[PDB]
Symmetry: D2
Subunit: 348 residues, 4 copies
């Protein structure tokens, strides 16, 4: 019933999200159990630091979850792009836990980075979609995300499923803390509602098809503004637009520069801003204002009922702050898909 | 005899680079001595990790020197933008060494980041230009970079002076290792020549003026391609272009996925850089290539502009590579009638 | 009504044990709150390792609680004798948490070790009885143990109060762990019973007095056998006998050597063995059997009701209430304090 | 050979076993230590939260004798555990611990149980073992075979001094990248070069020690050994030897912290508290046996003079008269030490 595998995969997300969590979360007692990590957790905690290493959209899923790992675990977490990690010859030692995120489990730069960490004595952990792929075999332990196959060239359901797996991994690491208990529960109860909220967000597709037809198809570039939890989503949205739609795009840290890209925008170029409550910073408001003043008409992704400015609005349900990126990425997936098909591009 | 403070400050770099090292490097014996830090070095090293925290060009100087800190010290080093560091409520603890880089020592997010780290019991180190500014006073210890006052609106000499001070800090932290003695000597001997090499690089100004006179100056954006040590230079070039020239620009990790400037000096001449360049020459895209004197990155059968710079030690190459970008950003602004 | 400050201080222990815990343990909700440390706990935890540093009986209170600190916190814990720490010039750094235990807060070697750690940038924590003493002032934070003044020359109540404060510190450090909750609850409920159990143990005095009036008073040496939690108690018992009774004494790790001191002892050499359930190891039973095999007549400190040596073999028992394993040392040391005291009295020594 | 007992042979063999332990491993001219068993593991061993040395009996003493030099040269926390007590406390161990197991036999039950405990917990394990291919040798990740040759006497003698040498070489190897350590490294390496000949010289104290053991010293019930600092381990090991071989009670005491008396008063460990303890003894006219450096007048007493070596190597020489005293006290008391 679907034009492309990509469209099918986007629409499959309530199912792929549920299947990633299946058998792993007791939503009643609020307990997370990851069979592949279970016996390794005590060891994983006992590291100097966690280094998340990935390429492309998997690198984004790491940026999207870095804050929650830091918050729940109080272990240092850094996020490396695999190729740049190898280019710097970054030192790795026995006391590092290196977490490798990959949909295919076969990306050359990820495998090379893995081999480098393995040779240095680090503990290695895979978060991988292709069961028994090279990355799954070669990591010491890990989690198969169970999202099913992706045929679309750009990753959609693997991003949301990876992000969920990474959240479950952070919850697992912090499952012995009294002080964390209430935050754990909050997140777990939030995760329970994600698949249905994704169903809801997918109902934006008509408004999105209209927006592309009326304001976007014709455009050479588009700028995405985000901060905090939503900066990763701005980078991922930009990558989707670039890969699928063959249009220029850039994710920008909102309001970081006064005199930067926004002091230098046309009253014409399309701008999408993340203004959901989890990442509604004064710098995001100033960025939006600097657009409206200039007579740009921003596209605002925000939570249902919110009045961000006096523009096009795409409303999404409100979830737990660290989960909001799971909902906010979906309209960007749909935008990139429709922009591409409306240009005769094959997305499969 | 300069039109603007920015032009004066760019041309001051052989002197500011020299002044940053003055009294701190024994070039004969290859000994670095940072008075502000030396009784603190054993404690700085005894940390779980180093967090470099800064904004803007100062954040770039951190990115430009991260690899040499990690290489020489084998201490984990992460680099944070002060505002994003705060947005995440990044936990920090007694075992962190937090290194704050700031020309002014007054930038609001850098200050708030500092106070946050201090409240959490971290050791704090300032790399600061304004002596006795907030950041200078409130950090436990530090190095004044001694670049002199910087009055241009965009940072030029403070970037190259911050980068030098950071390399001296990394050398200081690693001064007890026999295995890294040769690498220390290499870098220190390389640093001695940087001021005279900056003088050489400033000799590109005429070629750069000729470039900024061309229809380059009516472009809406400029892309900069770099990788490894030169990725920070690409990000900093793009900031200068946006800040000064009012032209859009983006620094791109070369080959990871309209005028184009590509960094192709030997320190950062990766296969991915070459393939990115080839992609541009395949569509006869006429790239501007920053490369080392005498290296033909692109054949004569493709139109391209070359800006040759001296070869230095790999982790010092960014000190020279940033200079043409400073000059391009300045002359683009002048050609566009911008009072820099 | 007491003959000496030392006697009074021994018999004051139900009250001092209570006083150390007072206002710090919610026994109903099982919460420990140490005001002196509360806001420093997250920082104390964030260390490479804990170094306990002390002299004499205060050093023994560290040995007596090392295992529970290790168990509850999973942070490396080492215990140093202050003078030896200084002799080795042991390297200390910013990532070390240094814990100084001292009754007086004025012992020279403890103060020198503190200054050494302070100047090296380590976090320092005092567990001190004398309020506002040098160690109390100079440590970053700490717990005043609240045992009251100790006038006896040998430490009695400050030992049990230090030991309790250290257990409370260990509980405070591990109070965020779900997996530790049952162990915390077990220990805290145990602590609540310690003051009344100390009172029970003190009822042993008549038996001990009779024993000190025995063939025991005549001999020149006494060996103590202990393992595990009770090794510290053997060392502290030997120190008390040496310091107070002026008799030679040695605390011996039980059954460690098959042909060590026990293969050499005279039939009539006085030997005290700790055989309470918390430290009743096969090696302890081995050592005890080696003693009785040679016709030795050991004194057995064991839990109420337990038969460690057959009634067929001559031996003395001093029975003590059973408590939580890591708290048993609080009860087991009491008879040694009383033995050292009555051995001294009977030899004319003035213990004050 | 011309020796009455294996134990006597093995004592007198120490110049040779000390040399053999070092052979092929120390370049004395260039001051370079190379331990083949460790070469590829050193960078990893250094990257640990801490080092735990774990051993029994005399091997536990060799850890105490070298703890200080490990701490000094490496700035890694070093703790020393008796294997049985380590197990008794169920002391936690983790991935980030380097656990160093010292054993002559490589077969001691508590040492093997402690090794398996550490292995299951994911610690890096390092063996310092005399019997090649023994349980401890095979099952540690990496290690150094001490090359002392077979030891048949039941009190360890040559295995103590060879374990102690092996451990010092291990400490030197861990700190071989430090510029600030270089002078100290060279001092200790030049010191080690002279140890075998210095042990030859100390063995010439034998007649003086026989004279001492012919006296009423052999009729005593207890012998107290006083030491501090580097020489505390020596005092413990001396006491163990007297108990194991001589069947006389002995205790190693930390000098001046609180009957024949031996006091270690060599310059490496000549603390105020040692001098105080010695004065206490002479004040009551107790007649101490003093082990001190050649030419030193420490203070009726007996003096056993030993050559001066580097502070952290002095234990290697000081232990030798204790081994001889234990052996001749046994012979005088009619005990077959074999
Ligand atoms: C492969 C397999 O039989 N998985 C079963 C396992 O799933 P479970 O979810 O427990 O484990 P995973 O499928 O995630 O992992 C399988 C194994 O692969 C390792 N691993 C995984 C990913 C990675 O990147 N690297 C890596 O080493 C894990 O540590 C584990 O040993 O128990 C479930 C019942 O609860 C079953 O329904 C699953 O079919
Ligand atoms: C400011 C000052 O009087 N500097 C003097 C210092 O230079 P020197 O180069 O030794 O020291 P710096 O100027 O770098 O540092 C001055 C002091 O400020 C501290 N600090 C510095 C920067 C920072 O961000 N945070 C921070 O805490 C340093 O730890 C130091 O205590 O000794 C020289 C003599 O050898 C004199 O010529 C300089 O005039
Ligand atoms: C001595 C004192 O005023 N104690 C008061 C403190 O008891 P509380 O039990 O809260 O505190 P302690 O007496 O244990 O500690 C007093 C102070 O001294 C510090 N410290 C203590 C011991 C040490 O060795 N080193 C050290 O630095 C502590 O960190 C603290 O700042 O607050 C209570 C209010 O609830 C009062 O009833 C107590 O009278
Ligand atoms: C046993 C062996 O083959 N030794 C050879 C090795 O000596 P070399 O001195 O190089 O090595 P060792 O004999 O010390 O150790 C041999 C191996 O056993 C390991 N190990 C050792 C002790 C221990 O307790 N645990 C442990 O795992 C080492 O890591 C190494 O892999 O090369 C020399 C030539 O260069 C040969 O003369 C020796 O015959
Ligand atoms: N086109 C996709 C992104 O949607 C690619 O960029 C991948 O994300 C990138 O190659 C990493 O792939 P991986 O997740 O299989 O390791
Ligand atoms: N305009 C400059 C860039 O050249 C700014 O981005 C500064 O670099 C940034 O504000 C940081 O300032 P600082 O170095 O004084 O803390
Ligand atoms: N005589 C007593 C023991 O009872 C002494 O050993 C002290 O315990 C020792 O001096 C330590 O004193 P302190 O706890 O005041 O620091
Ligand atoms: N009798 C000897 C000591 O002289 C024993 O104490 C051993 O030292 C002890 O059994 C350890 O043996 P090991 O070094 O073979 O592991
Ligand atoms: Na695997
Ligand atoms: Na300062
Ligand atoms: Na204090
Ligand atoms: Na082995």
């Amino acid at each position: 019933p679907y034009k492309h595998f990509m469209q099918k995969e986007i629409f499959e997300q309530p199912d792929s999200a549920f299947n990633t969590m299946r058998g792993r979360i007791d939503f009643e007692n609020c307990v997370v159990t990851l069979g592949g990590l279970k016996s390794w957790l005590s060891t994983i905690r006992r590291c100097r630091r966690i280094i998340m290493i990935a390429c492309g959209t998997s690198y984004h899923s790491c940026l999207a979850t870095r804050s929650i790992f830091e918050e729940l675990t109080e272990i240092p977490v850094s996020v490396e792009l695999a190729s740049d990690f190898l280019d710097r010859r970054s030192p790795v030692f026995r006391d590092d836990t290196c977490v490798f995120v990959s949909q295919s489990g076969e990306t050359a730069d990820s495998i090379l980075a893995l081999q480098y960490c393995l040779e240095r004595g680090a503990l290695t952990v895979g978060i991988v979609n292709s069961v028994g792929s090279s990355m799954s075999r070669q990591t010491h332990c890990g989690v198969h995300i169970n999202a099913g196959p992706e045929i679309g060239v750009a990753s959609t359901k693997a991003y949301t499923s990876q992000y969920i797996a990474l959240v479950m991994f952070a919850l697992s690491l912090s499952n012995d803390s009294i002080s964390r208990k209430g935050r754990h529960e909050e997140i777990i109860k939030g995760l329970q509602k994600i698949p249905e909220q994704i169903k809801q967000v997918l109902k934006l597709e008509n408004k999105i098809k209209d927006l592309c037809n009326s304001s976007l198809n014709d455009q050479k570039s588009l700028l995405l503004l985000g901060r905090g939890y939503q900066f990763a989503t701005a980078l991922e949205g930009a990558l989707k637009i670039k890969e699928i739609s063959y249009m220029h795009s850039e994710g920008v840290l909102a309001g970081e520069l006064k005199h930067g890209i926004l002091a230098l925008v046309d009253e014409d170029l399309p701008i999408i801003a993340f203004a959901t409550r989890d990442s509604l910073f004064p710098k995001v408001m100033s960025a939006i204002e600097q657009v409206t003043a200039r007579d740009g008409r921003p596209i605002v992704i925000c939570n249902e009922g919110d009045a961000i400015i006096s523009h096009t609005t795409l409303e999404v349900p409100e979830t737990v702050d660290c989960l909001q990126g799971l909902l906010n990425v979906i309209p960007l997936q749909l935008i990139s898909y429709w922009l591409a098909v409306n240009r005769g591009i094959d997305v499969d």
